[PDB]
Amino acid sequence: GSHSMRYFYTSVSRPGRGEPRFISVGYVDDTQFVRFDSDAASPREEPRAPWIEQEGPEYWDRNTQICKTNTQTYRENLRIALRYYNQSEAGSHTLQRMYGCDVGPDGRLLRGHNQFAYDGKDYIALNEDLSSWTAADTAAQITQRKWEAARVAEQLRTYLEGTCVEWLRRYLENGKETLQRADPPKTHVTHHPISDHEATLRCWALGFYPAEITLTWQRDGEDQTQDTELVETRPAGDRTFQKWAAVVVPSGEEQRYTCHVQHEGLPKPLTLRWEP
Amino acid sequence: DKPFLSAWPSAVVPRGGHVTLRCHYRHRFNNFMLYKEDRIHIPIFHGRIFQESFNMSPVTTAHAGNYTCRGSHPHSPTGWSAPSNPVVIMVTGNHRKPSLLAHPGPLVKSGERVILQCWSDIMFEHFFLHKEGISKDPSRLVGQIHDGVSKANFSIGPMMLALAGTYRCYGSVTHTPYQLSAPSDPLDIVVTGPYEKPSLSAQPGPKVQAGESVTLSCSSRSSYDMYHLSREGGAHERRLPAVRKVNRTFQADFPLGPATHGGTYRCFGSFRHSPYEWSDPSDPLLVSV
Amino acid sequence: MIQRTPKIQVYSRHPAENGKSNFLNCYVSGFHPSDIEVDLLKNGERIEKVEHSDLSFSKDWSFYLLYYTEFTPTEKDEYACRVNHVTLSQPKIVKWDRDM
Amino acid sequence: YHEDIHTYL
Ligand SMILES: *[C@@H]1O[C@H](CO)[C@@H](O)[C@H](O)[C@H]1NC(C)=O
Ligand SMILES: *[C@@H]1O[C@H](CO)[C@@H](O)[C@H](O)[C@H]1NC(C)=O
Ligand SMILES: *[C@@H]1O[C@H](CO)[C@@H](O)[C@H](O)[C@H]1NC(C)=O
């Protein structure tokens, strides 16, 4: 029932190596559905999941226009940040924005997001009350004063409570059979010697959607979090995900260890073990 | 099986306050994972396993929401309990407060009903009525928006001591559903009855000798600790401790003077440190000049 | 200026079987700034016609990208991913281990 | 659907 829509904007200056670049990508949960790249030949908002492709020409026209205007805006923002931070016009810098809405099972806004980073560090964020700002440094305090005067929070609140939630609901219906059907992980345990006296037990989770998953090892029923190697959840390339978790076990003790999995596609938490 | 999830001291908590979640399972405040809203198959906080309790302090807007726990159950087929009861943490202090009034008034006869009306010029979509105390759940009503006002009528009763006490109302808007307004000014609801009504009379008598001073005397053979004198059409209550002045009577003598208003009075007895229950009212008494 | 060096995972879309068509993935994540050079290698040689995802980033602002290509695993051939970034003096090469 | 805003630092 609970779902999210997020946009991720990246703007990069690169004096002498290219024009200032603006990229936007949009996601419903863990599924990318649109992209815009100012480096493209003739930039437009483009579909990246099939369930968005039947939106009409006015959808693509207006979201392209917003992105073209954003390209100009963020080029200016990079210049403004140079002034705030007393930086050289020859250097390369990055401005990022993430924003969007989380909806609960009732279709109501649960949480809104709107935050910015400059050169990889927090710059300014809209607080969870959707009415005040957290500025990270003295430069962002200038932006905060300007955005208070421009009533930016009130406009964001209107967008989050209206357009964002309404279009997220529409996308979830457009793509119901992929976005609202959890694909459970396919799970198995493998065994790989690290020496003549210890081996890795690796618990695999493959082919799952959405990407949130918990994967842990227990020994004799006790959590082994401190000894478990956990790789970052990674895309399989087909809009499903993969993860594994590994523990190093003494040879002959493999039966003490159990792997534990929770995922939205599993109606009960799952326990598995190594079997030769 | 099913843990008991609890918020202490209250699931309705101010921003900047404190609330602790505990997941009681297998006869212990157990280790647990937490879940939000409908998503009971995937834990929040990346599957963080809480030891004994989750302390939210200072409470922030981010803490508001609908929580469920599962208790740790090692050596079971799933490793975890079934989902607990859900607990909705509502964080208050995020909007201007509504107003709260009692209709026809805050003194309610035992067995009768009273309306607690919350209202605001803020267009709250929902109102919450909360009785002060520990581990109390609020009642919820949709806001009726009409003529630039949002309001809701909470029905309380049939009245008895369990329903008396201090109430506060809160508003919420749809765009931040578990974020409540500041609380309304508190409203004390007092039940009258079942304790026997006192007598209210002019003392020492209606005819007074030279050295006698007329008082409005509230009296009873019942062992009231205090008496309350109320004028009809007046919101002011006068209160005096009950005294054993004569015979076996418990009484208080409220002075009459040029500063006391004429009209119709009633008096009530009460017991110390139980401020929300009074006796049945005395028969009314006309006070002249 | 935050600089974060790329994390790299090289892996197949499906469990590998010698002679069966598959996809070779190089997931590059946790890096900042965004300029990055990624190639898939077969016996050290660059594979042409590799595809990639559009630049996105995580809650901590670090970037991630997926590069991928169709391939057929064999006993003899060694696959790898090669990444260059401002944090790297020379490209980092991570070999594909079908166990990981 | 994008927010129709052009916010400057
Ligand atoms: C809280 O979530 C539970 C399921 O986890 C649901 O049954 C219940 O209706 C929700 N309560 C509220 C007040 O939203
Ligand atoms: C709500 O309470 C008020 C008391 O002031 C009363 O006038 C009104 O009739 C009530 N509404 C309903 C529907 O009972
Ligand atoms: C005291 O008690 C006696 C006997 O009951 C009664 O006659 C008298 O009126 C009482 N005095 C007062 C002040 O009530």
XYZ file of C-alpha atoms and ligand atoms in Angstrom:
716
model
C 0.000 0.000 0.000
C 2.841 2.405 0.815
C 4.746 3.859 -2.124
C 7.066 6.705 -3.066
C 7.767 9.043 -5.977
C 11.182 10.702 -6.146
C 12.986 12.958 -8.553
C 16.783 13.192 -8.530
C 18.315 16.286 -10.172
C 22.059 16.577 -10.798
C 23.680 19.730 -12.160
C 27.423 19.803 -12.885
C 29.762 22.544 -14.029
C 32.786 21.448 -15.994
C 34.667 24.457 -17.378
C 36.472 23.568 -20.585
C 35.287 19.951 -20.680
C 31.615 20.514 -21.512
C 28.608 22.727 -21.110
C 26.998 22.790 -17.642
C 24.947 19.603 -17.518
C 21.504 19.021 -16.008
C 20.181 15.468 -15.533
C 16.851 14.522 -13.987
C 15.640 10.993 -13.271
C 12.280 10.052 -11.769
C 11.439 6.926 -9.761
C 8.316 5.228 -8.481
C 9.653 3.172 -5.577
C 12.706 1.420 -7.009
C 11.660 1.740 -10.679
C 13.035 4.524 -12.867
C 10.339 5.823 -15.199
C 11.686 9.044 -16.806
C 14.982 10.706 -17.672
C 16.039 14.112 -18.987
C 19.651 14.870 -19.940
C 20.701 18.294 -21.236
C 23.672 16.588 -22.935
C 21.320 14.670 -25.237
C 21.133 15.717 -28.889
C 17.681 17.337 -28.585
C 16.856 17.025 -24.905
C 13.357 15.967 -23.870
C 11.804 14.071 -21.005
C 12.011 10.424 -22.089
C 10.221 7.254 -20.916
C 12.271 4.670 -19.038
C 9.534 2.222 -18.007
C 6.880 0.938 -20.414
C 3.939 1.851 -18.186
C 4.651 5.593 -18.634
C 4.699 5.423 -22.448
C 0.968 5.984 -22.998
C 0.878 9.384 -21.254
C -0.320 11.841 -23.861
C 1.599 14.536 -25.675
C 0.701 17.205 -23.126
C 2.436 15.177 -20.378
C 5.703 14.961 -22.314
C 5.424 18.570 -23.479
C 4.976 20.011 -20.003
C 7.522 17.854 -18.210
C 10.061 18.559 -20.960
C 9.396 22.290 -20.555
C 9.914 22.073 -16.790
C 13.231 20.278 -17.365
C 14.389 22.799 -19.998
C 13.631 25.627 -17.594
C 15.425 23.690 -14.843
C 18.500 23.433 -17.073
C 18.750 27.228 -17.208
C 17.888 27.607 -13.511
C 20.550 25.191 -12.290
C 23.206 26.688 -14.540
C 22.491 29.973 -12.762
C 22.436 28.245 -9.355
C 25.959 26.941 -9.958
C 27.075 30.534 -10.613
C 25.309 31.726 -7.444
C 27.048 29.039 -5.383
C 30.437 30.185 -6.724
C 29.636 33.626 -5.352
C 28.414 32.320 -1.979
C 31.517 30.180 -1.476
C 34.123 32.477 -3.092
C 35.167 29.772 -5.563
C 37.065 30.001 -8.848
C 35.234 30.038 -12.168
C 37.665 27.377 -13.422
C 36.626 24.639 -10.993
C 34.027 21.895 -11.406
C 31.094 21.747 -8.971
C 27.919 19.744 -8.344
C 24.418 20.751 -7.230
C 21.921 17.986 -6.390
C 18.231 18.069 -5.486
C 16.022 15.188 -4.361
C 12.306 15.651 -3.776
C 9.031 13.794 -3.750
C 6.277 12.176 -1.748
C 5.600 9.015 0.249
C 1.993 7.815 0.364
C 0.459 5.411 2.831
C -2.134 2.716 2.169
C -4.922 5.327 2.365
C -3.453 7.277 -0.564
C -2.735 10.229 1.733
C 0.620 11.967 1.868
C 2.691 10.371 4.632
C 5.949 12.268 4.174
C 7.322 14.867 1.814
C 10.934 15.450 0.803
C 12.836 18.358 -0.723
C 16.564 18.644 -0.107
C 19.717 19.938 -1.749
C 23.448 19.264 -1.691
C 26.383 21.268 -3.010
C 29.621 19.412 -3.805
C 28.297 16.330 -2.058
C 27.380 17.942 1.282
C 23.977 18.873 2.674
C 23.018 22.411 1.717
C 19.340 22.994 2.628
C 16.409 20.678 3.350
C 12.688 21.077 3.867
C 11.741 19.809 7.305
C 9.127 17.085 7.853
C 6.552 19.678 8.890
C 6.748 20.891 5.244
C 6.885 24.480 6.492
C 10.441 25.242 7.669
C 13.997 24.739 6.437
C 17.247 23.337 7.807
C 20.239 25.197 6.368
C 23.610 23.518 6.749
C 25.935 26.544 6.553
C 25.990 30.317 6.206
C 25.541 30.202 2.431
C 22.387 28.112 2.792
C 21.112 30.609 5.362
C 21.023 33.182 2.540
C 19.021 30.781 0.379
C 16.711 30.116 3.326
C 15.940 33.834 3.664
C 15.194 34.091 -0.057
C 13.013 30.973 -0.066
C 11.068 32.202 2.944
C 10.429 35.482 1.124
C 9.368 33.559 -2.011
C 7.072 31.238 0.027
C 8.855 28.217 -1.445
C 7.743 25.897 1.367
C 4.054 26.728 0.823
C 4.415 26.013 -2.900
C 6.212 22.735 -2.216
C 3.527 21.718 0.266
C 0.860 22.381 -2.377
C 2.767 20.284 -4.928
C 3.443 17.450 -2.488
C -0.126 17.229 -1.205
C -1.693 17.560 -4.654
C 0.181 16.907 -7.911
C 2.761 14.561 -6.393
C 0.282 12.277 -4.599
C -2.211 12.388 -7.485
C 0.305 11.427 -10.157
C 1.921 8.787 -7.939
C -1.555 7.223 -7.621
C -1.906 7.349 -11.416
C 1.501 5.761 -12.018
C 0.747 2.976 -9.548
C -2.385 2.153 -11.559
C -0.576 2.431 -14.919
C 2.085 -0.005 -13.755
C 0.113 -1.994 -11.191
C 1.178 -5.393 -12.450
C 4.881 -4.560 -11.879
C 4.871 -1.762 -9.273
C 2.282 -3.304 -6.896
C 3.118 -7.002 -7.293
C 6.053 -7.887 -5.074
C 8.409 -10.391 -6.704
C 9.805 -12.552 -3.872
C 13.495 -13.402 -3.759
C 14.709 -16.742 -4.959
C 17.078 -17.865 -2.210
C 19.890 -20.372 -1.796
C 23.083 -20.944 0.204
C 26.520 -21.583 -1.330
C 29.783 -22.739 0.233
C 33.308 -21.582 -0.642
C 36.542 -22.554 1.153
C 38.704 -19.668 2.348
C 41.391 -21.967 3.787
C 41.783 -25.615 4.683
C 39.822 -24.966 7.890
C 37.114 -22.343 7.221
C 34.618 -21.557 4.503
C 32.260 -18.812 3.452
C 28.567 -19.570 3.654
C 26.910 -17.131 1.270
C 23.142 -16.593 1.427
C 21.768 -15.365 -1.907
C 18.594 -13.442 -2.688
C 17.926 -13.113 -6.414
C 15.254 -11.639 -8.623
C 13.290 -9.642 -6.057
C 11.282 -6.430 -6.285
C 11.066 -3.969 -4.561
C 14.689 -3.542 -3.468
C 14.183 -3.390 0.314
C 15.211 -6.691 1.903
C 16.704 -7.976 5.134
C 19.268 -10.753 4.927
C 21.026 -11.904 8.108
C 22.951 -14.879 9.489
C 22.313 -16.493 12.866
C 24.550 -18.975 14.679
C 22.687 -21.173 17.167
C 19.828 -18.680 16.844
C 22.003 -15.680 17.764
C 22.454 -12.771 15.358
C 25.893 -12.623 13.714
C 25.677 -9.046 12.406
C 29.217 -8.152 13.508
C 30.709 -11.098 11.557
C 28.455 -10.927 8.474
C 29.654 -9.444 5.191
C 26.662 -7.807 3.491
C 26.987 -6.438 -0.050
C 24.953 -3.462 -1.184
C 21.700 -4.445 -2.859
C 22.353 -4.332 -6.576
C 20.240 -4.167 -9.740
C 19.988 -7.302 -11.830
C 19.331 -5.187 -14.946
C 15.747 -6.376 -15.525
C 14.132 -4.145 -12.814
C 14.752 -6.780 -10.136
C 17.469 -6.817 -7.503
C 20.054 -9.077 -5.908
C 21.829 -9.270 -2.560
C 23.947 -11.673 -0.613
C 25.190 -12.072 2.948
C 28.234 -14.116 3.939
C 29.660 -15.547 7.159
C 33.001 -17.278 7.669
C 32.455 -20.581 9.453
C 34.833 -23.249 10.799
C 34.784 -26.444 8.780
C 32.375 -28.899 10.369
C 30.201 -26.202 11.992
C 28.053 -25.319 8.971
C 24.909 -26.759 10.589
C 24.991 -24.107 13.327
C 24.216 -21.330 10.834
C 20.859 -20.215 9.437
C 20.096 -17.424 6.976
C 17.081 -15.194 7.594
C 15.165 -13.244 4.944
C 12.332 -10.727 5.047
C 10.840 -9.137 1.936
C 7.439 -7.747 0.975
C 6.980 -10.758 -1.349
C 7.418 -13.259 1.502
C 4.204 -13.602 3.559
C 6.302 -14.940 6.475
C 9.949 -14.363 7.400
C 12.089 -17.067 5.847
C 14.842 -19.297 7.279
C 17.302 -21.324 5.197
C 20.534 -23.309 5.624
C 23.405 -24.832 3.671
C 22.754 -28.288 2.275
C 25.514 -30.078 0.278
C 2.191 -15.477 18.569
C 1.191 -11.817 19.068
C 3.303 -9.296 21.043
C 1.834 -6.336 22.892
C 3.233 -3.077 21.516
C 2.886 -0.110 23.889
C 3.842 3.572 23.947
C 4.884 5.026 27.299
C 3.690 7.287 28.809
C 1.389 8.199 25.890
C 1.068 7.577 22.155
C -0.177 11.177 21.865
C 3.023 13.089 22.537
C 4.274 16.635 21.956
C 7.144 17.429 19.699
C 10.078 17.795 22.057
C 8.486 15.271 24.414
C 9.417 11.682 25.028
C 7.842 8.341 24.182
C 9.186 4.805 24.537
C 7.979 1.837 22.490
C 8.192 -1.610 24.039
C 7.331 -4.973 22.488
C 6.253 -7.385 25.223
C 6.491 -10.949 23.913
C 7.061 -14.364 25.516
C 6.580 -12.876 29.004
C 9.380 -10.341 28.548
C 10.033 -6.916 27.110
C 11.697 -8.685 24.221
C 14.006 -7.853 21.344
C 12.013 -6.720 18.362
C 11.900 -5.233 14.908
C 9.534 -2.429 13.952
C 7.216 -2.066 10.957
C 5.307 0.933 9.620
C 1.764 1.292 8.249
C 0.728 -1.723 6.165
C 4.259 -2.974 5.413
C 4.369 -5.817 7.947
C 6.582 -8.056 5.790
C 9.605 -5.738 5.742
C 11.048 -3.984 8.818
C 11.952 -0.318 9.068
C 15.434 0.940 10.057
C 17.111 -1.634 7.773
C 15.971 -4.426 10.072
C 17.402 -2.927 13.246
C 16.747 -5.257 16.182
C 15.799 -3.211 19.240
C 17.001 -4.332 22.679
C 14.169 -3.987 25.234
C 12.849 -0.605 24.084
C 12.891 2.163 21.491
C 13.235 5.593 23.118
C 12.136 8.593 21.037
C 13.549 11.620 22.858
C 13.262 14.423 21.958
C 10.227 13.423 19.915
C 10.333 14.854 16.411
C 7.815 15.162 13.602
C 9.629 12.241 11.932
C 8.568 9.940 14.797
C 4.844 10.187 14.021
C 3.272 7.178 12.353
C 1.619 3.783 12.585
C 3.904 1.123 14.111
C 3.803 -2.642 14.543
C 6.436 -4.872 16.140
C 7.466 -8.484 15.813
C 9.154 -10.134 18.754
C 12.296 -12.211 18.486
C 11.534 -15.953 18.571
C 14.731 -17.941 17.973
C 14.558 -21.630 17.039
C 11.110 -21.149 15.473
C 10.374 -21.707 11.757
C 10.318 -17.969 10.934
C 12.462 -16.632 13.793
C 9.863 -13.963 14.668
C 6.432 -13.545 16.194
C 3.264 -12.621 14.396
C 2.657 -8.870 14.037
C 1.733 -7.050 17.233
C -1.177 -4.727 17.774
C -0.577 -1.431 15.932
C 0.330 1.746 17.816
C -0.173 5.163 16.228
C 2.264 7.747 17.550
C 0.666 11.165 17.047
C 3.030 14.098 17.466
C 1.355 17.310 18.623
C 2.351 20.949 18.353
C 2.417 21.476 14.577
C -0.537 23.856 14.060
C -2.352 26.512 16.026
C -4.653 24.988 18.609
C -8.408 24.579 18.154
C -10.946 25.722 20.722
C -12.858 23.316 22.948
C -16.138 23.989 24.753
C -18.681 21.898 26.619
C -22.369 22.058 25.713
C -24.512 22.857 27.624
C -21.622 23.140 30.084
C -18.821 21.298 31.868
C -20.863 20.234 34.935
C -22.619 17.035 33.850
C -25.198 15.113 35.863
C -24.415 11.455 36.448
C -26.014 9.405 33.670
C -26.415 12.295 31.218
C -24.467 13.210 28.102
C -22.421 16.280 27.254
C -21.142 17.551 23.907
C -17.477 18.515 23.708
C -17.274 20.723 20.621
C -13.879 21.287 18.999
C -13.715 24.048 16.435
C -11.265 26.175 14.522
C -10.959 28.775 11.818
C -8.234 26.449 10.519
C -9.806 23.907 8.153
C -8.815 20.771 10.023
C -9.967 17.628 8.241
C -10.039 15.620 11.483
C -10.311 16.335 15.187
C -8.990 14.258 18.078
C -10.356 14.395 21.618
C -7.939 13.215 24.293
C -8.588 12.729 28.006
C -5.530 13.569 30.113
C -3.807 10.595 31.695
C -1.432 7.776 30.887
C -2.062 5.288 28.063
C -5.261 6.978 26.845
C -6.387 6.616 23.226
C -7.928 9.647 21.484
C -11.287 9.605 19.775
C -11.424 10.837 16.185
C -14.090 12.696 14.221
C -14.147 14.216 10.755
C -14.204 18.007 10.691
C -17.450 19.558 9.444
C -16.348 22.521 7.340
C -19.039 25.200 7.076
C -18.996 29.024 7.024
C -15.224 29.352 7.329
C -15.154 27.108 10.417
C -14.243 23.461 10.971
C -15.870 21.751 13.920
C -16.754 18.403 15.460
C -19.137 17.412 18.254
C -17.760 14.708 20.556
C -20.478 12.944 22.556
C -19.466 11.955 26.108
C -21.650 9.823 28.354
C -23.670 8.452 30.088
C -21.578 10.415 32.542
C -19.695 8.743 35.397
C -16.341 9.307 37.054
C -14.367 7.331 34.445
C -15.419 9.919 31.848
C -14.780 12.985 34.026
C -11.507 14.833 34.046
C -9.441 17.076 31.808
C -9.892 16.899 28.038
C -7.917 18.485 25.208
C -8.742 18.600 21.508
C -6.413 18.514 18.518
C -6.815 19.165 14.808
C -5.074 17.468 11.923
C -4.854 18.251 8.216
C -4.779 15.573 5.533
C -1.339 16.571 4.219
C 0.377 15.597 7.521
C -2.003 13.058 9.046
C -0.209 11.975 12.242
C 0.991 15.544 12.907
C -1.502 17.087 15.279
C -2.039 20.708 16.172
C -1.086 22.220 19.497
C -3.634 21.070 22.112
C -6.700 23.165 22.814
C -6.881 24.883 26.156
C -7.767 22.147 28.677
C -11.404 21.649 29.595
C -12.383 20.115 32.941
C -15.517 17.958 32.895
C -17.005 17.369 36.350
C -19.648 14.724 37.084
C -22.301 15.659 39.653
C -23.597 12.687 41.599
C -24.209 10.134 42.922
C -23.293 11.557 46.353
C -26.264 13.001 48.229
C -27.020 16.665 47.689
C -26.158 19.062 50.518
C -28.567 21.557 52.017
C -28.131 25.218 51.083
C -29.682 27.753 53.447
C -29.308 31.187 55.016
C -27.681 30.778 58.440
C -27.861 31.103 61.420
C -31.377 31.964 60.282
C -33.441 34.257 58.064
C -34.156 36.442 61.110
C -30.872 37.603 62.639
C -30.035 39.108 66.028
C -27.711 42.080 66.515
C -24.546 39.991 66.845
C -25.471 37.467 64.145
C -24.105 37.623 60.595
C -25.975 35.989 57.708
C -24.092 33.434 55.598
C -24.958 31.067 52.766
C -24.359 27.723 54.445
C -23.830 24.472 52.570
C -24.274 21.510 54.896
C -24.535 17.729 54.996
C -24.319 14.763 57.318
C -22.038 13.254 54.657
C -18.287 13.676 55.210
C -17.503 16.040 52.318
C -14.067 17.642 52.435
C -15.024 20.748 50.467
C -18.043 22.663 49.291
C -18.534 24.533 46.019
C -20.975 27.440 45.705
C -22.187 28.319 42.200
C -24.432 31.140 41.044
C -26.906 30.351 38.284
C -25.713 32.266 35.236
C -22.317 32.809 36.883
C -19.180 30.948 35.834
C -17.374 31.663 39.112
C -17.262 28.913 41.727
C -16.502 29.741 45.350
C -14.869 26.934 47.328
C -14.500 26.447 51.068
C -13.278 23.536 53.162
C -15.954 21.676 55.043
C -15.826 22.242 58.793
C -17.343 20.380 61.728
C -18.839 23.444 63.376
C -21.955 22.112 65.123
C -23.618 18.775 65.837
C -22.475 16.107 63.344
C -22.862 18.450 60.355
C -20.146 19.120 57.785
C -20.643 22.681 56.597
C -19.111 25.715 54.931
C -20.406 29.255 55.489
C -20.017 31.497 52.470
C -20.216 35.184 53.455
C -22.965 37.387 52.108
C -22.051 41.020 51.690
C -22.434 44.084 49.491
C -20.028 42.425 47.028
C -22.057 39.218 46.636
C -24.635 39.268 43.858
C -28.253 38.311 44.251
C -29.721 35.474 42.282
C -30.072 31.718 42.407
C -27.319 29.615 44.008
C -26.572 25.898 44.301
C -23.882 24.142 46.252
C -22.055 20.846 45.893
C -19.863 18.724 48.122
C -16.664 17.045 47.044
C -13.839 14.905 48.391
C -10.189 15.902 48.671
C -7.968 15.178 45.652
C -10.940 13.861 43.610
C -11.671 17.177 41.890
C -13.767 15.867 38.991
C -16.662 14.410 40.959
C -19.063 16.519 42.984
C -22.257 15.623 44.799
C -25.705 16.065 43.338
C -26.463 19.815 43.464
C -28.380 21.272 46.379
C -31.860 22.526 45.659
C -31.435 26.076 44.329
C -31.642 28.972 46.776
C -32.758 32.514 45.977
C -30.426 35.076 47.547
C -31.960 38.526 47.972
C -29.901 41.715 47.589
C 35.245 19.263 -1.787
C 33.887 15.838 -0.884
C 35.466 13.115 -2.983
C 34.243 9.538 -2.570
C 35.866 6.635 -4.360
C 33.623 4.238 -6.326
C 32.455 0.944 -4.906
C 32.336 -1.743 -7.609
C 30.408 -5.004 -7.937
C 30.792 -7.211 -11.010
C 28.263 -9.998 -11.405
C 25.891 -11.745 -13.782
C 22.151 -11.228 -14.050
C 21.518 -14.973 -13.693
C 23.604 -17.722 -12.064
C 26.355 -18.480 -14.541
C 26.472 -21.571 -16.745
C 29.297 -21.970 -19.257
C 27.873 -21.624 -22.757
C 24.517 -20.109 -21.734
C 23.691 -16.527 -22.715
C 23.599 -14.111 -19.775
C 24.235 -10.471 -18.851
C 27.422 -9.113 -17.301
C 26.789 -6.266 -14.843
C 29.120 -3.673 -13.339
C 27.361 -1.716 -10.595
C 29.352 1.364 -9.591
C 28.138 3.226 -6.533
C 29.047 5.451 -3.621
C 31.121 7.904 -5.646
C 31.365 11.683 -5.821
C 31.769 13.697 -8.023
C 29.798 12.182 -10.871
C 32.349 12.072 -13.712
C 33.316 8.436 -14.132
C 34.657 6.094 -16.809
C 33.374 2.535 -16.777
C 34.195 -0.300 -19.153
C 33.482 -4.018 -19.247
C 36.469 -6.169 -20.187
C 36.905 -9.581 -21.778
C 40.459 -10.905 -21.241
C 41.476 -7.326 -20.484
C 40.027 -5.952 -23.742
C 37.234 -3.383 -23.822
C 33.819 -4.702 -24.824
C 32.023 -2.499 -27.335
C 28.288 -1.712 -27.282
C 27.979 -1.787 -23.493
C 24.850 -0.058 -22.175
C 24.295 1.837 -18.954
C 21.667 3.317 -16.680
C 21.004 7.023 -16.249
C 22.914 8.843 -13.509
C 21.110 8.764 -10.154
C 22.178 9.009 -6.524
C 21.482 7.725 -3.015
C 20.190 9.362 0.167
C 23.796 10.255 1.123
C 24.164 12.078 -2.260
C 26.660 9.563 -3.678
C 26.096 8.529 -7.288
C 25.410 5.127 -8.788
C 25.318 3.654 -12.294
C 24.858 0.210 -13.834
C 26.868 -0.833 -16.906
C 25.909 -4.065 -18.618
C 26.319 -6.197 -21.708
C 25.128 -9.495 -23.125
C 27.785 -12.205 -22.773
C 28.308 -15.976 -22.665
C 30.476 -17.290 -19.799
C 33.194 -19.801 -20.635
C 35.891 -21.660 -18.741
C 38.671 -19.881 -20.632
C 37.488 -16.262 -20.692
C 38.042 -13.809 -17.853
C 35.597 -10.923 -17.487
C 36.144 -7.750 -15.507
C 34.982 -4.188 -14.960
C 37.335 -1.199 -15.243
C 36.566 2.105 -13.494
C 38.376 5.425 -13.543
C 37.455 8.358 -11.354
C 39.167 11.476 -10.019
C 39.907 9.597 -6.766
C 41.843 6.896 -8.654
C 45.416 7.408 -9.861
C 44.936 4.560 -12.357
C 41.800 2.621 -13.321
C 40.519 0.089 -10.818
C 39.864 -3.360 -12.282
C 37.547 -5.836 -10.549
C 37.405 -9.358 -11.957
C 34.136 -11.245 -12.342
C 33.991 -14.108 -9.838
C 30.885 -16.167 -10.550
C 30.729 -17.015 -6.816
C 30.101 -13.347 -5.868
C 5.197 14.654 -12.704
C 7.793 17.350 -11.998
C 7.203 20.279 -9.702
C 6.598 23.387 -11.828
C 8.985 25.660 -9.978
C 12.322 27.250 -10.846
C 14.004 27.927 -7.500
C 17.240 29.898 -7.336
C 19.811 29.710 -4.557
C -2.315 1.068 11.340
O -1.866 -0.004 10.525
C -2.632 -1.201 10.685
C -1.902 -2.295 9.940
O -0.524 -2.322 10.284
C -4.033 -0.947 10.160
O -4.807 -2.128 10.333
C -4.671 0.205 10.925
O -5.900 0.563 10.304
C -3.766 1.444 10.965
N -4.299 2.411 11.914
C -4.486 3.707 11.639
C -5.057 4.537 12.750
O -4.206 4.190 10.546
C -23.142 20.346 17.851
O -23.097 20.950 19.126
C -23.710 22.248 19.170
C -23.526 22.765 20.577
O -23.078 24.114 20.582
C -25.180 22.165 18.760
O -25.687 23.489 18.632
C -25.344 21.433 17.433
O -26.723 21.173 17.195
C -24.589 20.111 17.456
N -24.693 19.436 16.173
C -25.246 18.226 16.033
C -25.289 17.682 14.640
O -25.692 17.600 16.989
C -28.396 20.219 66.330
O -29.127 19.010 66.584
C -30.389 19.162 67.250
C -30.957 17.770 67.404
O -30.900 17.049 66.179
C -31.300 20.076 66.439
O -32.510 20.286 67.159
C -30.606 21.404 66.167
O -31.419 22.204 65.316
C -29.253 21.175 65.496
N -28.572 22.442 65.283
C -28.374 22.968 64.070
C -27.658 24.284 64.035
O -28.751 22.402 63.046
